[PDB]
Write a protein that binds this DNA or RNA. Structure first.
Lengths: 56, 97, 48
RNA sequence: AGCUGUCAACCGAGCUUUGAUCCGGGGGUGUCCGAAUGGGGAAACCCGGCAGUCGUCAUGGGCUGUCACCCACUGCUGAACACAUAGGCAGUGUGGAGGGAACGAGGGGAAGUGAAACAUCUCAGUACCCUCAGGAAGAGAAAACAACCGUGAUUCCGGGAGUAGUGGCGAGCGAAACCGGAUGAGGCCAAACCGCGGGGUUGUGGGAUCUCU
RNA sequence: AAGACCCCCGUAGCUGAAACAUUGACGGCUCGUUUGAGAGACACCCAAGUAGCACGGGGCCCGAGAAAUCCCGUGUGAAUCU
RNA sequence: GAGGACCGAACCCACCAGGGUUGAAAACCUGGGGGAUGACCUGUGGUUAGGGGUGAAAGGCCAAUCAAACUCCGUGAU
RNA sequence: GGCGUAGUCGAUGGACAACCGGUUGAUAUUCCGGUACCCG
RNA sequence: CAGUUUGAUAUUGGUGUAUGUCUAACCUGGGUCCGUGAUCCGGAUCAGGGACAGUGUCUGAUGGGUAGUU
């Protein structure tokens, strides 16, 4: 869970060659970053999309 | 005084206890009362002193469990009660009758 | 990320130059230290 | 004109034409536990702080109010450290917490079973679980259909149709266009531009800015 | 006290509220507006880590197939009425 | 005057025999029997939970039930 | 939902002051008699 | 299928000749100080490691450890 944009993990199926379905999970690429919110130093879990966009 | 901060000692003293043991205790100037179960020995002493204007020497309290009773339908339980035995100074008496 | 320089940086350019650099280089080193700022249209007039 | 609930008789003693019992609306009281919330706890138990107050020579003891946490805002202070923040202090809030038969939206998600075995598939997005509600919910004012003719927000019901399709083309699954009905409704912002306010709201494109009538 | 329209309670039909609730109408009250229209210019604006695209998935009659539209994660990643 | 020392009551256990076997007892009784200062027995309070626990290891024990406890639900399974 | 800091609970342990005799149908280191002890 | 593991890619930068070096992302279960009565946590600050590792997506290998069945 990105603390900025609310991007959460997605759920789906992992499919084999035999086409057997099992449950897996796409977790977003969330990196722990030290940031300054309101002049105060704080550590956040942020997704690289927010980093790339400059939201932090 | 108001209608919420009004307290009267006569509420603590529910009623006297009439029985052979209580009668035997009268001769030793020990009076037995049934008191409000939420009261403590200190309240009992103050209540008796204010109600009867007597000098209380010591107060003993007996906590008595209600007696379970059978009925047509099943089992009921009488009320639990707290009994206080008040020992008065020599020469002091209470007319409970 | 292409950026406006506020100080002279070796091998990049002089102050006020608009140059393109890798995003990580600017985000972690240049911008925090005041050497550079993000491009904006307002940046162009600022240079002028 | 009787009445003192019922199992449920009985005794005794009372209230009542100065209008009871009974019925409807409002109000006062409402111990202790419980989200339980002063602290603790084996729920209905135990022990307190602060202010006020009754009592006593005074402690002891009564009675009233008040004191959990989180969040919103106003102020004081501002660490390691210097700005400074973190944090701490003060003041308030009809803010939250938990409960509930069914109905709803969004997520997670079985197996028995069927396939006369079984793994793709079915059962089934069911059972169950999680978050959030409202009296209903969701959807909803075209980046839609259609086919060169045209309809004009959404929802629900009967068809189209067990059809076109889909499927170890197995067991099974299964629309849409369009037609007939129930009800009927449209509004507002962001952006550009000007100083949180003005501005403007579009599909025949519209808005800004400037010039002219 | 056995089969009741006329014995009783009722029914048909009318009638009723100090009090408070629900909901109308009105008055106070509150709010909105108080220049507008046309012509010409200009290409300034019209929702961005989004659309699209690549990979891995979900759902749709459609079981990934030549697979459109719709949703998710990872990378890459525009334009503003031509 | 040491000992996972010796004999032997309490205590813990269960090798043999007989009884009991719709029993006095859903595992006991009677007579013998093993340990009995230690890897011992025991009380109170904690704690480990189901494809999991614990096990000086028998698939043993996990509320008289264990090659996967019990209850409700899918469920009127097949 | 799992863990956990400050804290707060949790005796089966630690700290803490009473003994003898008599009595009732039913209580006694609790009531009664004598002599003691601890805290305010 | 979990687990272990390989590579690409994002987080991820400068600079030199697949491989050096630097510091600034990132990591320290290293030291000291503050919140603070505090072995958790966070913030400082020195000491190192360092674009490696860890993590997300994609991907090859192994996989009775587990699961469904013939």
């Amino acid at each position: 869970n990105c603390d900025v944009c609310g991007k959460g993990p997605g759920f789906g199926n992992n499919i084999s060659h035999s086409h057997r379905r099992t449950s897996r999970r796409w977790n977003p690429n969330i990196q722990r970053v030290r940031a300054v919110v309101g002049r105060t130093p704080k550590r956040l879990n942020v997704c690289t999309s927010c980093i790339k966009a400059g939201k932090v | 005084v108001t209608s919420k901060t009004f307290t009267d000692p006569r509420d603590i003293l529910v009623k006297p206890v009439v029985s052979e043991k209580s009668y035997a205790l009268l001769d030793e100037n020990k009076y037995t009362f049934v008191v409000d179960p939420r009261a403590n020995k200190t309240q009992i002493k103050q209540a008796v002193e204010a109600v009867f204007s007597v000098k209380v020497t010591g107060v003993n309290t007996i906590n008595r469990q209600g007696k379970r009773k059978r009925t047509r339908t099943g089992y009921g339980k009488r009320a639990n009660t707290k009994r206080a035995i008040v020992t008065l100074a020599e020469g002091n008496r209470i007319d409970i009758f | 990320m292409k950026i406006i320089l506020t100080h002279e940086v070796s091998g990049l350019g002089a102050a006020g130059d608009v140059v393109d650099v890798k995003d990580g280089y600017a985000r972690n080193y240049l911008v925090p230290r005041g050497f550079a700022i993000r491009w904006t249209k307002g940046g162009e007039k600022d240079v002028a």
